Amino acid sequence: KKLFLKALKKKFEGEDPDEKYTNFYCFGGWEQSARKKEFTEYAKKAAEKRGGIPFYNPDIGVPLGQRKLMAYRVSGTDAYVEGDDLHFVNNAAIQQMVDDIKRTVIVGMDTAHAVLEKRLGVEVTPETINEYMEAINHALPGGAVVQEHMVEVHPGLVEDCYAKIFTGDDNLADELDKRILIDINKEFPEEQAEQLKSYIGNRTYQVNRVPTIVVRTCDGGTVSRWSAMQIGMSFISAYKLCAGEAAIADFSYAAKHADVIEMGTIMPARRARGPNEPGGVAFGTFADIVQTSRVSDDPANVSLEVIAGAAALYDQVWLGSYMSGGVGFTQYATAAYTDDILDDFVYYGMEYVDDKYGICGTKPTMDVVRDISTEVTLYSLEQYEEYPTLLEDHFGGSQRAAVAAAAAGCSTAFATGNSNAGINGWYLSQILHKEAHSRLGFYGYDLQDQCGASNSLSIRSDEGLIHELRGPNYPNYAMNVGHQPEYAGIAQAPHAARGDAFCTNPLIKVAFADKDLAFDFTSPRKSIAAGALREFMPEGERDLIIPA
Amino acid sequence: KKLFLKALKKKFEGEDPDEKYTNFYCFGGWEQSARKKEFTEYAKKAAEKRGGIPFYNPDIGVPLGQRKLMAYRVSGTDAYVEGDDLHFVNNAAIQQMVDDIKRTVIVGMDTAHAVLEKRLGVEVTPETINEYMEAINHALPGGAVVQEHMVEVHPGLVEDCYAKIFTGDDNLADELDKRILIDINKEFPEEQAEQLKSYIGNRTYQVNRVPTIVVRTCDGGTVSRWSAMQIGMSFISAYKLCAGEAAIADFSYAAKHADVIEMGTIMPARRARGPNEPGGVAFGTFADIVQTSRVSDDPANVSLEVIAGAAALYDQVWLGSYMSGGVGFTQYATAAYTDDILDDFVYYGMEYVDDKYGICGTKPTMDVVRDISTEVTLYSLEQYEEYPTLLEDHFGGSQRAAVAAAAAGCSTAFATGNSNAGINGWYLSQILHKEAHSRLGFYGYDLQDQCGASNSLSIRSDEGLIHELRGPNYPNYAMNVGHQPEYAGIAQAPHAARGDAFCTNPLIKVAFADKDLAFDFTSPRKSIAAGALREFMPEGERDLIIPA
Amino acid sequence: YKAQYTPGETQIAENRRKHMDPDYEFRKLREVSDEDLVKVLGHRNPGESYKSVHPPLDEMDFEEDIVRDMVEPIQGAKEGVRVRYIQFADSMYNAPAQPYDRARTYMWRYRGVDTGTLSGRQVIEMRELDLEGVSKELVETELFDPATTGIRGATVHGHSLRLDENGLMFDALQRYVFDEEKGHVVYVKDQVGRPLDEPVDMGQPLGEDELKKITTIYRKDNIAMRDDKEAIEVVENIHTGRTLGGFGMDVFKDDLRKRLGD
Amino acid sequence: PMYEDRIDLYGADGKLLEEDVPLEAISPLKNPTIANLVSDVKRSVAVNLAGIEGSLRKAALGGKSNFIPGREVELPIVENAEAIAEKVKKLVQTSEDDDTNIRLINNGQQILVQVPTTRMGVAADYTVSALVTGAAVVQAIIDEFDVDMFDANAVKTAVMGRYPQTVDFTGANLSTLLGPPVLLEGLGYGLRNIMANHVVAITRKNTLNASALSSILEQTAMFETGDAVGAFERMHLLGLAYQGLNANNLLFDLVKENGKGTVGTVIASLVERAVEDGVVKVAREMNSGYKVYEPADWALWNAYAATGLLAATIVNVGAARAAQGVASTVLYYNDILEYETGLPGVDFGRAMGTAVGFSFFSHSIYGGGGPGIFHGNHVVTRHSKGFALPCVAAAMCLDAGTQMFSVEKTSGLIGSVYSEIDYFREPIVNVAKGAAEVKDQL
Amino acid sequence: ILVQVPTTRMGVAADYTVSALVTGAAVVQAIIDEFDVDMFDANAVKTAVMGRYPQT
Ligand code: F43
Ligand code: F43
Ligand SMILES: C[C@@H](OP(=O)(O)O)[C@H](NC(=O)CCCCCCS)C(=O)O
Ligand SMILES: O=S(=O)(O)CCS
Ligand SMILES: O=S(=O)(O)CCS
Ligand SMILES: [K+]
Ligand SMILES: [K+]
Ligand SMILES: [K+]
């Protein structure tokens, strides 16, 4: 039975789901909505503060709710909410996810430890490292360690700020303080733990989480710098160095350049941003940030959870605000993580692949890509044709294109273990979709779509790139909604199918295996749902330093 | 009698101000401080939320408060606070100042109106403009105007978001809705209003203030884009255009490129940031953002207020966080706006200049620069020599260098009406300061100091530039504390002396003459002091959408 | 050529010249054993051999470089000894040595020097062997008042503060204490704050009156900068030369003429 | 000639190479060796075949501990380096007769690729050499081993890294002495983008050849930025001649006469020589007896001061055999020189200003690093217009092993690839050759 | 004025920005020399020719 039928039945209560006809213009417009009513009341109360500056007013322009305004089920959850509750501005959980990614940086410690031993004649032991890790959990949130008459940051404002450590060296891990250790053997299933440790080797890393209030006041480019400053201070403190000598410059260079792992890379001038902004986050990097891979062996579920997180990050926040703004792109994104619609299409594709090829059962070929992409696309289109309330749900073509193609692309990757085969399948799905419905998406939806087949397997300059390393700055992808969240899913898809511990970076994967993060990356859907119900507590609020 | 003597007396209560000897090691360390005891208590309570991860701990590293830990008086106010209350993370007023600058963009309306009339055959009247301004005050904060089934932004979260209009056309201004008008004739003294209009002509501009919660979630580069999107939506709505036709692209191009006035420009890759981040804000632009010029005829007062705001923006936030981070640079900055110390030096310089040359009484020559800079520097140095509690106050050389040279530089500008003469005076002060005390600032304080004289009046490639247009990305200036805030003062100084309505851009000056801004830009000192006392209410808090 | 060292017509300027003038021998005011010196430095144990950072120069093989081999390496570099540091705070109340004063002195008088000047501290980084030789001279002579010259590698706050009840400079870590019985300054910690097994007696503070005579800082209640018009004039001359050079159009007028010629 | 200045060119060994040469014969605008050098800098590309092979084998793609499990490709690339190099030649050349040069490095573990000047001539900037070499290596490898279409994009990624998701070639296995212009601090800074350690590795740690190479690139860049235009041109030429090319053996002799000296004694020697040569004269005497000096020739004084600067660097850092003191040396050479004379320091304070920041950022927490990683396109050391970085090159030649970020660690492969190019390795003798070739044509 | 910078200058420069950079410096100095612009006014001429660079 179709996975979306439950949600459709509750969304269109008391309506014949096979019926192509219905009643409109009979809901009282915006007054049908509890949320729109709340908004209007708050708008009124606000007049005095605004000194009469006109504000939110439903009588301006379009009269919303001539049709029935939908609630949405966050897929896999019991959260049924009006769409307004999923807007990133209205959803504290979506905001904290972005801030948690943005405020995280990973720094290798082996170079610094080598500096300590070869240049400063200091011996490094688990005991000195534990001392260092305690020092930096005082320094990182803004406490003084060296100078007299320092003023300091209010700890009540930065309780989310901390530093942890992980190592591929099991003997060292046994000696490190459990309070600040990310234990790879504890957090991951055995086979994943072994795979991670084989790529990490006997290397050691700290994971620094800068305060949320800092990245909100400032930006992503602040983070690696903030981290490096307090890494430096902590080494000076814990190892009793000259507070400013030649060897200190080596720590800085390591922490800022040579041994630092950032979440995202810088943008070109036209869309200029520093590191650790959403545009610089590669699809495979985001997939590794999401932690569903280590608590689930269901490849469809792992991919679906990545897409949910990626939808909020890339379409809602990045494209819907950073690169545009206003009412934005909530429903371009929610189409990919509500009402179990995408779930149905993906689980159909996985079943089809499992039966015909086996999961990771065949080398990628154009024959295999065409077979899977066509079948999954056809099936997805037929669902929208068979269920009128489904079509009324994904009322925008772009939404329907992204969802069908995601299912097509992920399935191709499930079969072949190849992400670029996956996106080649994605582009076939799109142009097939176009011929079937004599429509696709919005005005400029398929720019990358028509460019896509040729560039999917290209080896040229700014065309060829393994999909895992593509991201929002890949030229074809730089502008448009309804792609990037799904590309993250396709980057995840072959590795979930293979049961890989990670997609692109083991250090990133391990760095987010941490319960002390505010956002729960093991299930982006459940956290976003909590934010929709206003049950999620974000970091970085300023209640302690402002009037009541 | 010296202007700083009152504050010194309260800061060092019951102590002989001439005595070169005092008692140390007798205060109980950090427990002498109410703020540090508050910090320690919150840190303890935080253990539970942190699951045992170590946190703020005064026993880590240096034992603060071996000396007496000072309170600071915000200059011109009755606020005496511990320095911690002036840290940008602890001060919601400093945070809101940065956000108010960041979330502001100015857009010309004449080009759009020409598109409406010449390409779309629509007539523009004061009435249609009033309709447009009502539409955008619904659309800018995230309300729908054209599409059915739009979700919207909670108005309670974005009450600080609005659009206003100003025009050099008095007849048009008389017919616009006063609720959304910035009235040049009302906000500026008559002669300043005339000067502004002589540059502006009869042109019309809108000032869009994007929601605080948006720039905190995202960044400065979001703002001109957010503005442009909703300008587009509002024109489409108010003028009943096709919702997506060729002429619409002209609006977008005008609002994003051709007719937009941003606060700051982009950074180079090494310190990459989008528009409207602090590093891109030129000194004369910041001087124009500060509004003291239109409420005060005292040139020293106008410059001093600009320096206070600039200290918070450039040293505390930009250099102290964006470009570094951690405990940061609070007192490098506060030296320039506390205890009326800089005030004394500047008012000494102004009186010296007024008596000998007259305000704007002479052409700039090296003779004049040498005379004023030397005199003011000597006087400022002798104060630190004459008052032991003053030297103990500005205990860091960088602080003392910046404050003395600021007085030297502003005074030079007061006499000559030339900002470049002003900074040339600044650099003379610095190397003179160095010879007198056989010290100057921190390790790398005088990079720009030693390069300064030669590049002050240079005309070459990346050396020559009129000082008003210099900023934090001017190469010599890109790295170091204790310069940029003071440079903003020097940029303001000759224009304050001249009684100019603005320093670099009349449009920016008018755009911040607005009582509905949260931060009071007529007096940065008073707002910062209110933030220090936790009496300032910031925008963008999320209490409405989170648990209690 | 007869070197001038620095401009100025006051005793402060003269004191600076004497510090820089290599033919002027520093007056030795006190005795500090090699062991106590090594102890306060806090880098190594007295009696142990110097540790290397790289092999000795003769055990390494170099390609021919005439220019390099024209420069005599210091002993510590010959032996490949690690680089270490010593760091002072100098009270602004007429400490006998002052930060840029130190740097200019070192670069005239010592070889293979890395020195950093700051308002609150002045540091030397040097081959440890040669560092110890240099450091002895820096603590035994008139360049060192045990009361107003603090040895400190970190937490350096104090140069700008009032002196304590016994006339000693502030030290947040109190690496030295006042011995009331003898009236001596005694180091009980090394320069980074590790407690010493056996404290080191640095002797008596110099008098206020003696410091006023020999200090290298200008102060209004002693000899004001304002009184040294010669020094100010030369500072302005340096500033002016830099300004005109940066502008270039006038000082290079003859160069421009040729570029424009024909 | 435009200018009247004549100079004697001396080699790194202190011996006369070419006598009575007009100043413009060493101008970047006239000297044919400098032209050839700049040309080679722009068109030369280092390809790391072993790196490509290793990256492919592990699917270590995009660098910085990126791995993409399941996308591994196994190819015997280094084993077939000669066949690959020949195909790269065919794809990169414009004719069989052009100046394309391919050379195996480290027995084929690496390759030097020199793109023909014809391609450079119809390109806007210099990125073409990497871009074209990149496309050639990718197609050569795919063609040589018949790589499957679905594996082929891994080869592209292995060669050129994260581009175009990144603005540059992050994690790539090819490189060029110049980085992409999109990472430049300032307009026209291309030739300033070469780390001091690269200069040292390229010149095989020979002191004066390193300072010469750095000076040639810096001063040539000053022509590109328009700083060496009109009034300022002669200053930069004299700077190049004296500080970079040991004109009249002044540099070699200041070091020689101060082999057991200090920064102070180098200054004394320099000031004396300047008075002797009429470069500088007493303007007035002060009450103490202090003599205030003034330049008789401003551009020439700056060149003399700049020469004493490099000499003082060699003497003080050479004495330590530890490079960390170079920043300190550059700073106090100028500081002491100014108060010794009342003259403006090197580059009118900008060399000194640079050294202040250079000192800070090589001894603190806020950024920078060891002295070997600095260059003219660095925010810290960009500020002097050609007169500071040659000291850094010289200093790293003299370091005997005190650095973590040493020449071998940062620049080993780079030295192996480019030091074969004779003009790179021994610029002084070859620039003198170029000067002789054109002195009569001026 | 149309200014076409000699290929000789282009040949020893890394990229094409040299032509604007050199022309800019020539025009700035040409104007200052022709009218004997005061030292304190001269930086206004530079700013008029090359704009906000290098703050931008
Ligand atoms: C004015 C444009 C042209 C443009 O540049 N963007 C618009 C409008 C813009 C506005 C609408 C705000 C408002 O109404 O006040 C916003 C929200 C962007 C913003 N400024 O914040 C938006 N669209 Ni549009 N826009 C959407 C969509 C769509 C779909 C709607 C088709 C339908 O049958 O309803 C069509 C494109 C298409 O036909 O494929 C569409 C076009 C259009 N879209 C037409 C208006 C069409 C009309 O007159 O109704 N959007 C969608 O397909 C779903 C996602 C939805 C976005 C909001 C969200 O994600 O929650 C919104 C995304
Ligand atoms: C460790 C360094 C080296 C470095 O790269 N930065 C340091 C330390 C850094 C840390 C100190 C944090 C801590 O103690 O935990 C911070 C706050 C930057 C950060 N990471 O957040 C800072 N300095 Ni510092 N730093 C300062 C200053 C100074 C002054 C202090 C001299 C004195 O007598 O106290 C001197 C430089 C000088 O001598 O000119 C100085 C040096 C130093 N500064 C020496 C440590 C000196 C020591 O051992 O005590 N700073 C100042 O001059 C005042 C402003 C003050 C800054 C904090 C603020 O602005 O509120 C702080 C700015
Ligand atoms: C030099 C550079 O650092 P890197 O050398 O790139 O590590 C630069 N930092 C800074 O300039 C720090 C500026 C603020 C801290 C020092 C204030 S004195 C930056 O992060 O881009
Ligand atoms: O109608 S357009 O396709 O231009 C934009 C839809 S969001
Ligand atoms: O001591 S340093 O000058 O390096 C930094 C002072 S904040
Ligand atoms: K509406
Ligand atoms: K932000
Ligand atoms: K502490």
Same domain membership, residue A95 and residue A161: no
Is A499 an annotated catalytic residue? no
What's the CATH code of the domain at B258?
A: 3.30.70.470
Same domain membership, residue D28 and residue D118: no
State the count of interchain CB pairs (< 8 A) between B and D. Answer: 83
Q: Report yes or no: D176 and D169 within 8 Å, Cβ to Cβ.
A: no
Looking at the complex, report in whole angstroms how far the Cα of residue E49 sits from the nearest Cα belonging to chain C: 17
What's the CATH code of the domain at D227?
A: 1.20.840.10
Neighbours of chain E (3+ CB pairs under 8 A): B, C, D
What's the CATH code of the domain at B427?
A: 1.20.840.10
Residue B339 in domain:
yes
- A299 vs D contacts (CB less than 8 Å): none
DSSP labels for C35-75? HHHHHHHTSS-TTSPPPBSS--GGGS-----HHHHTSPPPH
Catalytic residue among A430, A480, A492, A505: A480
Residue B469 in domain:
yes
Boundary residue ending a domain (A41, A76, A101): A101
The reply to whether residue E15 touches residue D190, judged by beta carbons under 8 angstroms, is: yes
Residue A541 in domain:
no
Catalytic residue among B201, B358, B444, B464: B444
Same domain membership, residue A359 and residue A481: yes
Experimental method of this PDB entry: X-ray
Q: Is the dihedral of CA D235, D237, D243, D247 positive or negative?
A: negative
> How far is the C-alpha of A478 from the C-alpha of A501, rounded, in Å?
29
Looking at the complex, report in whole angstroms how far the Cα of residue D125 sits from the nearest Cα belonging to chain E: 4
Residue B532 in domain:
no
Provide the domain count of chain D: 2
What's the CATH code of the domain at D83?
A: 3.30.70.470
Same domain membership, residue D285 and residue D371: yes
Question: Does residue B396's CB lie within 6 angstroms of at least one atom of ligand 2?
Answer: yes
- D354 vs B contacts (CB less than 8 Å): 447, 451
Measured in whole angstroms, the distance separating CA C78 from the mean position of its chain's CA atoms is 24
Same domain membership, residue D282 and residue D415: yes
Considering every ligand atom, which ligand is closest to the CA of B328?
2
Task: Tell me the HSE value of A374 on the side-chain side, using a 13 A CA sphere.
Answer: 6
Same domain membership, residue D48 and residue D32: no
Same domain membership, residue D419 and residue D288: yes
Same domain membership, residue A365 and residue A460: yes
Q: Which two tokens stand for residue D358?
A: 């250079």
Closest chain A residue to the Cα of C83, Cα to Cα: A119
Same domain membership, residue D267 and residue D396: yes
D83 C-alpha to center of ligand 2: Å?
59
DSSP state of B338: B
- B545 vs A contacts (CB less than 8 Å): 90-92, 531, 534
- The answer to whether D379 faces chain E, any CB pair under 8 Å, is no
Residue A497: which domain range? 277-505
The reply to whether residue B378 touches residue C225, judged by beta carbons under 8 angstroms, is: yes
β-strand pairing of B104-108 with B204-209: antiparallel
Boundary residue ending a domain (A276, A304, A331): A276
Atom of ligand 1 nearest to the CA of A329: 59
Three-class DSSP category at A106: strand
Q: Which amino acid is at A375?
A: E
CB within 8 Å of B162: residues ≥ 6 apart? A50, A53, A55, B137, B140, B141, B180, B209, B516
Same domain membership, residue A400 and residue A368: yes
E23-47 burial string, b = 16+ CB within 10 Å, else e?
Answer: bbbbbbbebbbeeebebbbbbbbbb
How many other β-carbons are positioned within 10 Å of the β-carbon of residue A476?
19
The answer for C 70-109 residues in CB contact with D (under 8 A) is: 70-74, 77, 80, 83, 100, 103-104, 107-109
Q: What number does CATH give the domain C1-262?
A: 3.90.320.20
Same domain membership, residue A116 and residue A94: no
Q: Which amino acid is at D420?
A: E
Same domain membership, residue B463 and residue B371: yes
- Residue bearing the CA closest to ligand 4, atom 2: A443
E strands in A472-539: none
How many other β-carbons are positioned within 10 Å of the β-carbon of residue B297?
10
CB within 8 Å of B288: residues ≥ 6 apart? B502, B503, B504, B505, B508, B509, B512
Number of H helices, E strands in chain E: 3, 0
> How far is the C-alpha of B351 from the C-alpha of B367, rounded, in Å?
19
- The answer to whether C186 faces chain A, any CB pair under 8 Å, is no
Q: Report yes or no: D309 and D240 within 8 Å, Cβ to Cβ.
A: no
A91-115 burial string, b = 16+ CB within 10 Å, else e?
Answer: bbbbbbbbbbbbbbbbbbbbbbbeb
Same domain membership, residue B166 and residue B68: no
Is B480 an annotated catalytic residue? yes
Boundary residue ending a domain (D140, D167, D190): D190
Same domain membership, residue A86 and residue A178: no
Residue A539 in domain:
no
Same domain membership, residue D364 and residue D242: yes
- Resolution of the coordinates in A? 2.2
Same domain membership, residue A321 and residue A432: yes
Q: At what angle do helices B299-310 and B524-532 cross, to 10 degrees?
A: 40
Same domain membership, residue D179 and residue D319: no
B222 C-alpha to center of ligand 6: Å?
24
Q: Which of D39, D191, D229 is closest, CB to CB, to E25?
A: D229
Is D366 an annotated catalytic residue? yes
The answer for A 85-124 residues in CB contact with D (under 8 A) is: 111, 114-115, 118-119
Same domain membership, residue B118 and residue B256: yes
> How far is the C-alpha of A339 from the C-alpha of A326, rounded, in Å?
25
The reply to whether residue B475 touches residue D185, judged by beta carbons under 8 angstroms, is: yes
Q: Report yes or no: A213 and B89 within 8 Å, Cβ to Cβ.
A: yes
SS3 content of chain E, % helix, strand, coil (to 5): 60, 0, 40
Closest chain C residue to the Cα of D15, Cα to Cα: C66
Same domain membership, residue D197 and residue D175: no
| Length of chain D in terms of residues written | 442
Q: Report yes or no: A10 and A389 within 8 Å, Cβ to Cβ.
A: no
Same domain membership, residue D164 and residue D207: no
Among residues A484, A497, A403, the alpha carbon closest in space to that of A448 is found at: A484
Measured in whole angstroms, the distance separating CA B515 from the mean position of its chain's CA atoms is 17
Q: Is C42 left (phi over 0), alpha (psi -120 to 50) or beta?
A: left
How many other β-carbons are positioned within 10 Å of the β-carbon of residue A328?
27
Q: Report yes or no: C185 and C205 within 8 Å, Cβ to Cβ.
A: yes
Residue D137: which domain range? 44-190
Provide the domain count of chain A: 3
> How far is the C-alpha of B430 from the C-alpha of B452, rounded, in Å?
10
Domain layout of chain C by residue ranges: 1-262
Q: At what angle do helices A419-437 and A447-456 cross, to 10 degrees?
A: 140
Same domain membership, residue B465 and residue B326: yes
Considering every ligand atom, which ligand is closest to the CA of B60?
8
Residue A548 in domain:
no
Q: Report yes or no: B335 and B380 within 8 Å, Cβ to Cβ.
A: no
- D366 vs B contacts (CB less than 8 Å): 324
Is B21 an annotated catalytic residue? no
- D347 vs B contacts (CB less than 8 Å): 454
Helix locations, D99-178, DSSP H? 117-121, 128-145, 149-160
Contacts of residues B171-175 at CB distance under 8 Å and 24 or more positions apart, as own/partner, are: B172/B126, B172/B129, B172/B202, B172/B204, B175/B126
Same domain membership, residue B145 and residue B91: no
- The answer to whether C108 faces chain B, any CB pair under 8 Å, is no
Among residues A122, A309, A101, the alpha carbon closest in space to that of A207 is found at: A101
Helix locations, D207-291, DSSP H? 207-224, 233-239, 245, 250-256, 263-276
Q: Is B171 exposed, middle or buried (0-12, 13-18, 19+ CB in 10 A)?
A: exposed
Closest chain B residue to the Cα of E32, Cα to Cα: B459
> How far is the C-alpha of B180 from the C-alpha of B137, rounded, in Å?
9
Same domain membership, residue D318 and residue D196: yes
Question: What torsion, rounded to 10 degrees, do the Cα atoms C26, C27, C29, C33 define?
Answer: 50
Strand partners, D45: D113
Residue B522 in domain:
no
Among residues A104, A321, A145, the alpha carbon closest in space to that of A240 is found at: A145
Residue A12 in domain:
yes
Task: Tell me the HSE value of B209 on the side-chain side, using a 13 A CA sphere.
Answer: 28
SS3 content of chain D, % helix, strand, coil (to 5): 55, 10, 35
Same domain membership, residue D262 and residue D229: yes
Boundary residue ending a domain (D142, D172, D190): D190
What's the CATH code of the domain at A4?
A: 3.90.390.10
